[PDB]
A = this chain, B = another copy of it.
């Protein structure tokens, strides 16, 4: 009946519904490991704390739920900082649990103690705090979880000293609370909703744009009923893309990027409904190249700061994105008198197809495999039973041109942080979530980026996670090499070439299946063979460097 602080943590996690953790062992946090072992909660242990943190992200992003990461004092915490920052700008819900030096023997120059871990995380978390008494563990763990899961989602840090964790108390003297927090988000005032719907009804070329908060709550059947009653076409940023997979084809606009050529075609949108999509990198900042200056904008976001930050808007609503979608479907089931919109949907469709065909007529694979042709080979395997993870600059810019006409189960790309390497860990976490849902995970990364976490091939084999890692190999840090040539001069390249190393050989030495290909025919056969086996694999693809993707010109 006497129990440890580590037990208290794990009993609270169970009551909150968590089924998996991601981490790397240390003596400071061993009480949490022992408690998980007793209760049959698995911990996926990696080869780097960074990979563990990004895996918690991937699990959250692919499964639309909470992720949990577990690291030790000192370097255990500092190795987790890139994942924390990435989750902060992507609005993704992760609980980071960290060890730290004992409170008794504070300030004694001892092993792994002495860095102010809370101060380091303050600028990049929704909340960050250090626990002062063992009795407080259940209430504070649950409080941290409530902060992460509410709108807008984001990362939280709970710091647990090695004192506080090893301490033993009477289990009968401290209660474990339930997670009591409504699953339904708040919705707009009925007067704001009426105004929004009247604007939508009288528009000639209306458009919808989804962002990350739409993916976090995943209100698919409501979104479907709303789109079916109004006939309004829908676009998304990277993180919102998979929310379009269940819509009828005639209302699928794709990624926001191909709103670019609408102006030069006399087809600039009339009105745009932004649901959780911010003014920023993915939406063309304040330039008006995608969201026109002449259009009327309705914006819905849980954070008032974002409402028209870079551009004038017509109506600004603070509410939950899922709750709003839900309210739009309800009003629109009573209503049911909506103008046709068949011609406008055809126009949206025709413009996207024009971009695609234009790219295709310019891509050649004589004497070297073109990046666009390589992307096309992946695309024919993409559907509801697949999660796609994208890393590596030039690689994902080319890949995005084939992503609009297919319907992925999940799509996970870079956000605002834009940091090379986060892909490997992200994909590993996603595959853990996809197994319970019956789906396959595929990572598409660059030859530069894969090096950040190449050790994780060992983890894939140890844990038997059948992830497929595809490397687009152009012998260089690609986008950065392009910058030097384009912005400085043809003979001004330094520190950007990578003309060495057999990546498939490295995976083989760790016990995973390795392939090397260099054409449409060989790549096609290798991918089909990898999908047919229930095992991890590495496919090393020789690809040309010279071609410039349309998005790089912007």
Question: Measuring CB to CB, which residues of chain A are less than 8 angstroms from any residue of chain B?
Answer: 23-27, 30, 33-34, 36-37, 43, 45, 47-48, 74-76, 78-79, 81-82, 85-86, 88-89, 103-116, 119-120, 122-124, 127, 129, 132-133, 135-136, 139-140, 143, 146-147, 149-151, 175, 177-178, 180-182, 184-189, 191-192, 278-281, 285-286, 304-305, 307-310, 312-320, 323, 326, 416-422, 451-452, 454-455, 458, 461-462, 477, 479-480, 483-484, 487-488, 492, 494-496, 498, 500-503, 505-506, 508-511
Contact = CB atoms under 8 A, between A and B. Distances in A.
Contacts of A279: 108-109
B114 A89 contact: yes
Contacts of A188: 182, 184, 186-187
Q: Which 10 A-B pairs have the closest CB atoms?
A: A75-B419, A109-B280, A505-B509, A184-B189, A186-B186, A150-B304, A186-B319, A146-B304, A451-B455, A116-B123
B25 A109 contact: no
A185 B181 contact: no
B495 A25 contact: yes
Contacts of A185: 189, 318
Contact of A314 (B120, B180, B418, B452): B180
A494 B462 CA distance: 13
B509 A502 contact: yes
Contact of A305 (B133, B146, B462): B146
A127 B111 CA distance: 21
Contacts of A119: 119, 122-123
- Counted per complex, copies of this chain come to 3
A19 B26 CA distance: 39
5 contacts: A109-B309, A110-B416, A452-B455, A461-B500, A500-B510
Label chain A's interface by main secondary structure.
loop
A181 B305 CA distance: 10
Nearest to A161: B132
A104 B136 CA distance: 9
Contacts of A178: 312
Given A75-B419, A143-B309, A184-B191, 13 more contacts: A25-B480, A43-B495, A75-B85, A75-B422, A108-B285, A111-B416, A112-B419, A114-B416, A139-B310, A182-B192, A462-B500, A505-B505, A506-B506
Contacts of A308: 177, 180
Contact of A103 (B133, B418, B421, B462): B133
Contacts of A150: 304, 318
Contacts of A75: 82, 85-86, 417-422
A308 B136 CA distance: 14
A85 B89 contact: no
Given A140-B107, A452-B48, A34 B124 contact: no
A310 B142 CA distance: 11
A185 B304 CA distance: 11
A192 B187 CA distance: 12
B281 A30 contact: no
B186 A323 contact: yes
Nearest to A150: B304
A182 B107 contact: no
Nearest to A135: B104
Contact of A500 (B175, B184, B421, B458): B458
A140 B108 CA distance: 11
A318 B175 CA distance: 24
A120 to B, nearest CB: 6
Given A78-B82, A182-B317, A501-B511, A451 B506 contact: no
B74 A78 contact: no
A71 to B, nearest CB: 11
B451 A458 contact: yes
A128 to B, nearest CB: 10
Listed residue (A175, A182, A316, A487) with the most chain B CB atoms within 10 angstroms of its CB: A182
Contacts of A281: 109-111
Contacts of A122: 119, 122-123
Nearest to A37: B494
Nearest to A85: B78
A110 B146 contact: no
A139 B308 CA distance: 9
A84 to B, nearest CB: 8
